[PDB]
Amino acid sequence: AVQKVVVHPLVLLSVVDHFNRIGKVGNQKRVVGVLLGSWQKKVLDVSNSFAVPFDEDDKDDSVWFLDHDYLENMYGMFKKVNARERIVGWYHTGPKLHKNDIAINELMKRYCPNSVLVIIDVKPKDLGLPTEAYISVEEVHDDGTPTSKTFEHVTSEIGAEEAEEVGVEHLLRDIKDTTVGTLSQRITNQVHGLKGLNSKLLDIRSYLEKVATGKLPINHQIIYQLQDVFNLLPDVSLQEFVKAFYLKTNDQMVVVYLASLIRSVVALHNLINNKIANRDAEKKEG
Amino acid sequence: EDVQALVSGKLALRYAGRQTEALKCVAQASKNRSLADFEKALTDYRAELRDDPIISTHLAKLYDNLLEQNLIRVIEPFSRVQIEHISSLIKLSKADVERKLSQMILDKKFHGILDQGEGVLIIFDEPPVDKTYEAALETIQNMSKVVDSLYNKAKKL
Amino acid sequence: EQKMLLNLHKKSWMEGLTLQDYSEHCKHNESVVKEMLELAKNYNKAVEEEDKMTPEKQDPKRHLEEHVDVLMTSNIVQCLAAMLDTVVFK
Amino acid sequence: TRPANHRQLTFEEIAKSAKITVNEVELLVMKALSVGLVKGSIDEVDKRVHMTWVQPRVLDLQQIKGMKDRLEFWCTDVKSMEMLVEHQAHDILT
Amino acid sequence: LLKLFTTMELMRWSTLVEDYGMELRKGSLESPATDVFGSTEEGEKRWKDLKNRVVEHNIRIMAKYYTRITMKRMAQLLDLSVDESEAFLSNLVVNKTIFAKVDRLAGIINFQRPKDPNNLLNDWSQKLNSLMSLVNKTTHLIAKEEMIHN
Amino acid sequence: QAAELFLDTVSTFTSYELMDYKTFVTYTVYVSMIALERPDLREKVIKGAEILEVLHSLPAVRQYLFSLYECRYSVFFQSLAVVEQEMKKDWLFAPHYRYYVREMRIHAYSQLLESYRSLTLGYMAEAFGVGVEFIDQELSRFIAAGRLHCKIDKVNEIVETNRPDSKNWQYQETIKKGDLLLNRVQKLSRVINM
C-alpha cells in the first residue's frame, strides 16, 4: 500500500485559490482538481496541482463531469514545464465524501494505478490537519463481511521544500509566533494539547454512542484497536514508578533552584550597581 | 604450565628437590585456582616459601589477588548471600572471608555491603554519581563567593 | 490563506503533550549546569574587578542570563508536561 | 474485564477462572506469552503475575456501552484538567 | 525433539525422558539409535549433557518470562535439588549468558534487569505518545467511518 | 594543611636545627593518618618509600600506621594508647593531644563501619580488643556528637549504619549550602530601604 503522503504549501494554496475562484461566481459544495507528485520508497510527495473543469449533480450522485482531454493536455503542459511531477491523486474541497466520488477515483486510476484522493477543507480553520488522504481498496475483509469498493484512510502531513518554506515564512512573518517562545508558547501548547485530546476523546465518545445505539455499523476493526488503546494506559501510582517520578521531579526542582538562585543573585547585582550609579550622580550634582 | 616445562629442563634437573617441588605445586595451585591447596603448599614448604623474603612477599601478593578474584567470581550470581555459604565455596573460614570482604569493600575495589547481624552480604546497583549535583554544589559555592564579593561592595552604598 | 499556510509549522496536540526524552533532558541539564559553572567562574573575576579602571557586553553576565533562562524554562516545561501526563492520562 | 486498574492478576482468580490447580497457571501464562498473544510477566514468590496486553479482540454492544462509560470518566478528567490549567495559568496563557 | 527445543516454552526433563528416551538412546530395529546416548560412559556423558541443555533452555524460558522465582520452584521445575539448581544457575550466570541474581537469604531469584529512573520514565513516555498516536489514527478512521453515510 | 606541608617536604627536609628527621617522619605519619582519607594514606604515606625506609628503624609507629591501614583494630588501639603518651609528652603536640586521640577513634570506627550495614556490638568489641559496654559508650558519645552515621539497637546490641547514599548526601549538601547562601542573600537583602 501507501504508508504516507506529504503535502506542500503550493497545492493547498492552489486549491484555496481554486475554491475562492469558483465560489466567487459559481458557489458549489466542492471543487475538484488534480495533484502532481513523486514517489520515494513508498511515501508520496505532492507539490503541484491544477483545477480541472468539474460538475456534480445535486442528488443523483452518479452524474458528473471531469474533463478527460483538459486533464490530459494540462498534465502534458505541466510536464513540459516540469517533467518530474506525474499525476498522483486528485483533490476536492467538500468536507464530506459522496457516493459519486469513487467513480471520480476510478477515472483517475486510468491515469495513475494507485491514485490517492485528498480532501482539503478550506473553510475549516480549526484544531489541525486540514488535509485528509484516502486510497481505493477492494478486498474480502477476511471476516465474512461483504466486500465493497471502499475508501481507506492513509495518514497525511504538511511538509515544505525550502523555497516554499521561505515563501510561506515571509507571508506568515507578521502573524508569526516565535519558534522558541520560552514559557508562554510552551504553556499555551500544553493547554492546546489538552484541548485536542479532549476533542478527540469526545469524538470517540460520539462514535461509541452511535455504535451502541446502532445508527452506525460496527467496524469490528478500530474498535478493537480502540480497546487495545484503552488497555495501553500506563496506570501511574504503581510504587516504583512513583519513586522514579519523585526522583526525576526532584532533579528538575534542584536544577530550577540553581537557576532561580542565580537569577536572584544577578538581580541583586544589578540593583546594587544601579543604586551606586544614581547615588554617584546625586552626590556629583551637589 | 611452563613451570613443569622448566623443572624438567637439562640444567634444572640437577637441582630437583624440596625447593623445586614447592614451586611446582604452587604453580599447580595457580593453574586450578585451588586456594586450599595453595595454602597447603605454603604450609608444607614453610622453610621454602615463608622465610625467603622475595618469595614470601610475591606469593602472599598472589594469594591475596587470587582470593579477590575467586571472591568476585563466586559473589557474582548473588544479590544477597550468606557469608557462611561463600566461606564454604571458597574453603576459607568465615573469620577470614569476612575480614577479606570488609577490606575489599573498604578499598572500594568491589561494590557490596555486609551485615553481620544477619550474616549476609548484599550486592547493589551503584548509581552513577549524577555529576549534576556536584556541578550544582560548585556553582552554589561560587555564588556564595560572589555574594561575599557584593558584600565587599555596597559598603560604598 | 493565513493559518492555512500556518498549518505547516502548526504544532500538533500530541507534539504539545510530548514528554521529550528523559535521558536527553538529563544530558541537557548536565551540560548546561556545567556551562553555568564555567560562566560563574569568570563572573566571580568580573565582579572582583569592580574597581573601575578605565571604565569600559561580552561573556559572563548576559551569557549567564540566557543560560538560566533556557535551563529554567526547559526544566519547568518538562516537569509540567510530565505532571500533566501523569494526572490526565490515568 | 478491567482497564488495567486491577491488572495485577492474582493466581487464585485465574486458577478458578480456568478451574485448574495453582501449579498449572504458570504453564497457562507461559503458553499465552509463547503464542505471542499476551506480553505479561510472571512472579512466583508472590504468585501474582505482571500482566500487559497487546492483542485486541471482538467487542459486543455490551462491551461498547461499558467502554463508552469508562471513556466518559477519562474524558471528564481531561476536561477537568483543561479548565483547571486554563484557570490557574490565565495571566501567562493569555 | 528439534521443534520442542525450538518452542519458547518449558519441557520437564523427566517428562522428556518418559516421552522419548526409549526412541533416543535405544530405539528399535525399525528406528535405529546411534551410540550418541548409549549406556556406556561416553553415551552417558552425552545424555547428561543433554539434560544440561534441557535445563539451560528451561532457564532461558524462565528468564524470558518470570520476574522472580523461589529457587525451590526452579529446582522442582528442573527436577534438581536446591543446591544443584543454585550451582547450575551460578555457573550459567558467571558465563554472562543471561542476567539473574540470587537473594539466597530471602530465597528468591530475580531475572528482570534493574531499571534506572530515566529508562523507566522514558518507557512511560513512549507508551504515552504511542497511545496518543493511536488515538489520533483512531479518530481519523472514526471520521472515515462516519464519513460513509454520505 | 600540616599533613600536606609535611608530605611535600618529607624527601627534602633539611631543618636539622629544629629537630631530627625521624621525629619529622613521626610527626608526618601522625598528622597524615588523622588528616588524610584512606586512598591518599595509601598513595602518599604507605607507598612513600622514604617513610618506610625510616620506619624500618622505627617499628613502634610502623605498627600504629599499618594496623589502621590493615584493619588490625585491636593492635591499632594498643598502638594508639601507647602513642597518646608521646603525644602528651610532646612539647608542641600536648595542647591538642586529647583531640587527636579522639579523632583517630572516630576515624577508626568510621573505617570499620564503612564495610558493614549492621553488626553486633560484640564483633567490634572483639575487633578493637574492648568490651561491649565501653564501645557502646564510645559510640553513644560520638553519634551524639554527630561524628558517626549509625544508630544502636541495644535490644539486640547491633550497630546499624544510616549513611546517606550519593544522591541523598548530595541533596543534604545542596540544601545546607542553600541555607548558608540564602541567609547571606537575606542579610544582603534590605539594601533596599536603608
Q: What's the sign of the alpha-carbon dihedral B134, B137, B141, B147? A: positive
Q: Are D67 and A208 in contact (CB under 8 A)?
A: yes
Nearest residue of B to residue E103, measured between CA atoms: B80
Query: In Å, what resolution does this model reach?
Result: 3.6
CB contact under 8 A, B143 and A261: yes
Nearest residue of A to residue C30, measured between CA atoms: A255
3-class state of residue C52 by DSSP: coil
Q: What's the sign of the alpha-carbon dihedral F28, F30, F35, F36? A: positive
E-chain residues within 8 Å CB-CB of B82? 104-105
Looking up cell 614448604 gives B45
Amino acid (one-letter) located at C25: H
- Considering only CB atoms, B150 lies closest to which of A262, A272, A279, namely A272
- Based on the number of CB atoms within 10 Å of its own CB, is A49 exposed (0-12), middle (13-18) or buried (19 or more)? buried
* C-alpha radius of gyration, chain A, whole number: 28
Whole-angstrom distance, CA of residue A207 vs CA of residue B118 = 61
Separation in Å, CA of D17 to nearest CA in chain A: 20
Specify the experimental method.
Answer: cryo-EM
Q: Work out the angle at residue A254's Cα, subtended by the Cα atoms of residues B113 and E123, and round it to the nearest 5 degrees.
A: 70
Looking up cell 545546607 gives F176
Contacts of F42 (CB under 8 A, 6+ apart): F69
Strands E101-103 and E108-110: antiparallel
C-chain residues within 8 Å CB-CB of E139? none
Can you list the alpha helix ranges (DSSP code H) found in chain C? 13-17, 22-48, 60-88
- Based on the number of CB atoms within 10 Å of its own CB, is A133 exposed (0-12), middle (13-18) or buried (19 or more)? buried
Nearest residue of E to residue B118, measured between CA atoms: E105
H or E element in which residue E68 lies = strand E68-69
Separation in Å, CA of A220 to nearest CA in chain B: 47
Whole-angstrom distance, CA of residue A143 vs CA of residue A90 = 31
Which DSSP letter does residue A178 get? P
- Among B138, B143, B148, pick the best mutation site for testing chain C contact (most C Cβ within 10 A): B138
Q: What are phi and psi of A37, to 5 degrees?
A: -165, -175
Nearest residue of C to residue A165, measured between CA atoms: C8
- Considering only CB atoms, B146 lies closest to which of C30, C33, C44, namely C44
E114 and chain A in contact, CB less than 8 A = no
A-chain residues within 8 Å CB-CB of B143? 261-262, 265
Whole-angstrom distance, CA of residue E75 vs CA of residue C22 = 41
Report which of D59, D36, D58, D40 is spatially closest to residue D49, judged by C-alpha positions. D40
- Across the strands, what pairs with E68? E110
Q: What are phi and psi of E46, to 5 degrees?
A: -65, -35
3-class state of residue D9 by DSSP: strand
Q: What are phi and psi of C47, to 5 degrees?
A: -75, -25
Whole-angstrom distance, CA of residue E20 vs CA of residue E7 = 17
E113 and chain A in contact, CB less than 8 A = no
CB contact under 8 A, A13 and C1: yes
Distances (CA, A) of F151 to A79, F117, F134: 86, 11, 16
Cα C41 from chain centroid (whole Å): 20
Amino acid (one-letter) located at B127: P
- Based on the number of CB atoms within 10 Å of its own CB, is C10 exposed (0-12), middle (13-18) or buried (19 or more)? middle
D67 and chain E in contact, CB less than 8 A = no
- Cell, residue B74: 563466586
| Nearest 10 degrees: Cα torsion D47, D50, D54, D60 | 70
Concatenated DSSP letters of C25-46: HHHHHHHHHHHHHHHHHHHHHH
- Among A256, A261, A262, pick the best mutation site for testing chain F contact (most F Cβ within 10 A): A261
Q: Are A35 and A89 in contact (CB under 8 A)?
A: yes
Chains F and C touch (3+ CB pairs under 8 A): no
- Cell, residue F93: 603536640
Residues belonging to chain F: 194
- Across the strands, what pairs with A150? A137
CB contact under 8 A, C87 and D81: yes
Q: Are B108 and E132 in contact (CB under 8 A)?
A: no
B140 and chain A in contact, CB less than 8 A = yes
Contacts of E97 (CB under 8 A, 6+ apart): none
